[PDB]
Amino acid sequence: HGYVSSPKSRVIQCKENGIENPTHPACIAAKAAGNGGLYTPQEVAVGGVRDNHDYYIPDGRLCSANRANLFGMDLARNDWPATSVTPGAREFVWTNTAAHKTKYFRYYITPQGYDHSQPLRWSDLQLIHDSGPADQEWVSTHNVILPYRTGRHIIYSIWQRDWDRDAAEGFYQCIDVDFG
Ligand SMILES: [Cu+2]
């Protein structure tokens, strides 16, 4: 159980903007599509997953991990609240509510030119970081090297719980960033 707190993931950006009465236009939209999962940002979860996330999560459902109460997270928008980034090293931090033995934390990113016009697909993601396995960590920090980009981008971090040492389960976090 956990989520990316820094840069704030999309479920955290919108949580903090107000789940019941959001004011930001993307989160207002997310409310209408399914956002009551925003109370439990640590749970964008899939049970049984063993490094085969695309079997369990359909394209267009990467941000909700296909959970309906987060379907608002699946909307294509160029106005998601985003953190300013630049190419090079950026810390990404997972705040874990319940620690687990870890096969890996991985990060992916959209390609240069990405236009936010369709929901996020597996084919949209390039691997940009792999943290390797870990023991339990209350806080998991990955210094991800951001490739050259301009414009707004989506980062997808994925937490694979170590199924050999522990249990099979996946946690999924879409983060919005802006390369300027
Ligand atoms: Cu957990």
Short mmCIF file of C-alpha atoms and ligand atoms in Angstrom, two decimals:
data_model
loop_
_atom_site.label_atom_id
_atom_site.label_comp_id
_atom_site.label_asym_id
_atom_site.label_seq_id
_atom_site.Cartn_x
_atom_site.Cartn_y
_atom_site.Cartn_z
CA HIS A 1 0.00 0.00 0.00
CA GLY A 2 1.35 3.30 -1.20
CA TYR A 3 1.36 6.25 -3.65
CA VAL A 4 3.81 8.88 -5.12
CA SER A 5 3.73 11.90 -2.89
CA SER A 6 6.52 13.92 -4.58
CA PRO A 7 5.96 14.99 -7.36
CA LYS A 8 2.29 14.58 -6.32
CA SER A 9 0.64 11.87 -8.39
CA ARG A 10 -2.63 12.65 -10.11
CA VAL A 11 -4.71 10.85 -7.37
CA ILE A 12 -2.85 13.17 -4.82
CA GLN A 13 -3.14 16.37 -6.84
CA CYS A 14 -6.86 15.88 -7.10
CA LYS A 15 -7.32 14.60 -3.50
CA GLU A 16 -5.83 17.78 -2.21
CA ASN A 17 -7.90 19.96 -4.54
CA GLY A 18 -11.07 18.47 -2.76
CA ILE A 19 -12.65 15.17 -3.53
CA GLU A 20 -16.31 16.23 -2.88
CA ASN A 21 -16.11 19.84 -4.16
CA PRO A 22 -13.06 20.15 -6.37
CA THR A 23 -12.39 23.53 -7.94
CA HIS A 24 -9.86 22.67 -10.55
CA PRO A 25 -11.45 21.88 -13.92
CA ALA A 26 -9.61 18.46 -14.45
CA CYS A 27 -10.59 17.28 -10.94
CA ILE A 28 -14.18 18.54 -11.42
CA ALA A 29 -14.20 16.33 -14.57
CA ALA A 30 -12.59 13.44 -12.64
CA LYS A 31 -15.35 13.70 -9.96
CA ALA A 32 -18.05 13.15 -12.64
CA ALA A 33 -16.21 10.12 -14.15
CA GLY A 34 -15.41 8.31 -10.80
CA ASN A 35 -13.26 9.70 -8.02
CA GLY A 36 -14.41 8.30 -4.65
CA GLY A 37 -11.21 6.17 -4.73
CA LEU A 38 -9.38 9.46 -4.11
CA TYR A 39 -9.77 8.90 -0.34
CA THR A 40 -7.53 5.82 -0.64
CA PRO A 41 -4.62 6.92 -2.95
CA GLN A 42 -2.46 4.07 -1.50
CA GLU A 43 -4.77 1.48 -3.01
CA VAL A 44 -4.54 1.92 -6.77
CA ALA A 45 -3.90 -1.80 -6.65
CA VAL A 46 -4.18 -5.06 -8.55
CA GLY A 47 -4.02 -8.37 -6.68
CA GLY A 48 -2.28 -11.39 -8.25
CA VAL A 49 0.02 -9.45 -10.58
CA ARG A 50 3.47 -10.95 -11.26
CA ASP A 51 5.27 -8.49 -13.62
CA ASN A 52 2.39 -8.85 -16.16
CA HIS A 53 0.50 -5.63 -15.50
CA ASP A 54 -0.86 -5.30 -19.00
CA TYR A 55 -2.88 -8.50 -18.66
CA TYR A 56 -4.83 -7.11 -15.67
CA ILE A 57 -5.00 -3.39 -16.69
CA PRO A 58 -6.72 -2.49 -20.06
CA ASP A 59 -5.29 0.40 -22.11
CA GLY A 60 -7.03 3.63 -21.09
CA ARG A 61 -7.13 2.28 -17.47
CA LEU A 62 -3.50 2.71 -16.42
CA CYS A 63 -4.26 5.56 -14.01
CA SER A 64 -7.23 3.87 -12.23
CA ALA A 65 -5.57 0.43 -12.38
CA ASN A 66 -9.10 -0.34 -13.79
CA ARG A 67 -10.84 0.55 -10.55
CA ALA A 68 -14.12 2.35 -11.20
CA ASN A 69 -14.00 4.78 -8.26
CA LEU A 70 -10.83 6.25 -9.99
CA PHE A 71 -12.07 6.22 -13.62
CA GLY A 72 -11.88 10.07 -13.38
CA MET A 73 -8.08 9.50 -13.31
CA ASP A 74 -8.29 7.98 -16.78
CA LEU A 75 -9.38 11.18 -18.58
CA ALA A 76 -7.07 12.65 -21.34
CA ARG A 77 -6.50 16.31 -20.35
CA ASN A 78 -3.68 18.77 -20.99
CA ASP A 79 -4.65 20.60 -17.80
CA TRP A 80 -3.98 18.05 -15.05
CA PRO A 81 -2.32 19.78 -12.11
CA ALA A 82 1.34 19.19 -12.88
CA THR A 83 4.75 19.64 -11.28
CA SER A 84 7.39 21.60 -13.17
CA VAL A 85 10.28 19.39 -14.14
CA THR A 86 13.44 19.56 -16.29
CA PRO A 87 15.60 16.89 -17.98
CA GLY A 88 17.93 15.16 -15.58
CA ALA A 89 17.70 13.75 -12.11
CA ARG A 90 14.41 14.21 -10.26
CA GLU A 91 13.51 12.50 -6.94
CA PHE A 92 10.23 10.52 -6.90
CA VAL A 93 9.00 9.43 -3.56
CA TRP A 94 6.49 6.74 -2.69
CA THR A 95 4.80 7.19 0.64
CA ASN A 96 3.89 3.70 1.67
CA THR A 97 1.00 3.23 4.12
CA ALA A 98 1.74 -0.46 4.34
CA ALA A 99 5.29 -1.62 3.45
CA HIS A 100 5.90 -4.73 1.33
CA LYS A 101 8.88 -6.77 0.02
CA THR A 102 9.53 -5.26 -3.45
CA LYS A 103 10.51 -6.84 -6.77
CA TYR A 104 10.80 -3.28 -8.16
CA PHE A 105 9.59 0.27 -8.52
CA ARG A 106 9.51 1.23 -12.16
CA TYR A 107 8.96 4.47 -13.94
CA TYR A 108 7.78 5.14 -17.50
CA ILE A 109 7.14 8.28 -19.50
CA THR A 110 5.20 9.51 -22.52
CA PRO A 111 7.13 10.37 -25.72
CA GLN A 112 8.07 13.79 -26.95
CA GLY A 113 5.05 15.18 -28.81
CA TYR A 114 2.50 13.45 -26.53
CA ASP A 115 -0.78 15.33 -26.93
CA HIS A 116 -3.14 14.22 -24.11
CA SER A 117 -5.89 13.50 -26.56
CA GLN A 118 -6.51 9.81 -25.73
CA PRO A 119 -6.40 7.92 -22.45
CA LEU A 120 -3.04 6.51 -21.53
CA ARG A 121 -2.08 3.21 -23.21
CA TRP A 122 0.66 0.74 -22.46
CA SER A 123 2.17 1.43 -25.92
CA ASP A 124 2.59 5.15 -24.82
CA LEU A 125 5.22 4.36 -22.14
CA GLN A 126 8.97 4.17 -22.37
CA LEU A 127 10.90 2.70 -19.40
CA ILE A 128 12.89 5.38 -17.67
CA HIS A 129 13.77 3.81 -14.30
CA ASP A 130 13.96 0.49 -12.47
CA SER A 131 14.76 0.55 -8.86
CA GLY A 132 15.55 -3.11 -8.37
CA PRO A 133 14.17 -5.18 -5.44
CA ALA A 134 13.93 -3.88 -1.88
CA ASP A 135 12.93 -4.90 1.58
CA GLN A 136 10.00 -3.11 3.27
CA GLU A 137 10.29 0.62 3.22
CA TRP A 138 8.03 3.15 4.74
CA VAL A 139 9.27 5.60 2.18
CA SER A 140 10.71 4.60 -1.18
CA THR A 141 12.86 7.08 -3.02
CA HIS A 142 13.94 6.80 -6.62
CA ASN A 143 16.11 9.37 -8.30
CA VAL A 144 14.68 9.00 -11.83
CA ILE A 145 16.65 10.44 -14.68
CA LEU A 146 14.11 12.42 -16.80
CA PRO A 147 14.93 12.27 -20.49
CA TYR A 148 14.85 15.35 -22.75
CA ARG A 149 11.22 16.45 -23.14
CA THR A 150 9.26 19.70 -23.55
CA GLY A 151 5.56 20.04 -22.80
CA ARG A 152 3.39 18.22 -20.39
CA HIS A 153 4.02 14.58 -19.82
CA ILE A 154 2.69 11.63 -17.92
CA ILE A 155 4.88 9.55 -15.75
CA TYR A 156 3.69 6.09 -14.77
CA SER A 157 5.28 4.55 -11.69
CA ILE A 158 4.55 0.93 -10.89
CA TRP A 159 5.27 -0.87 -7.66
CA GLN A 160 5.67 -4.63 -7.99
CA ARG A 161 5.38 -6.39 -4.57
CA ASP A 162 7.79 -9.36 -4.42
CA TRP A 163 5.64 -12.43 -5.04
CA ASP A 164 8.50 -14.88 -4.25
CA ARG A 165 9.13 -13.32 -0.91
CA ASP A 166 5.75 -12.04 0.03
CA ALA A 167 2.69 -11.67 -2.25
CA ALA A 168 1.77 -10.82 -5.86
CA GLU A 169 0.28 -7.34 -6.10
CA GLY A 170 0.78 -4.20 -8.17
CA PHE A 171 0.38 -0.49 -7.30
CA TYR A 172 -0.01 2.10 -10.03
CA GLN A 173 0.56 5.83 -10.11
CA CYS A 174 0.11 8.32 -12.89
CA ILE A 175 2.03 11.59 -12.20
CA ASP A 176 1.63 14.76 -14.35
CA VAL A 177 4.78 16.83 -15.02
CA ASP A 178 5.57 19.86 -17.13
CA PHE A 179 8.87 20.24 -18.94
CA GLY A 180 7.99 23.84 -19.93
CU CU B 1 -0.15 -3.02 0.48
#
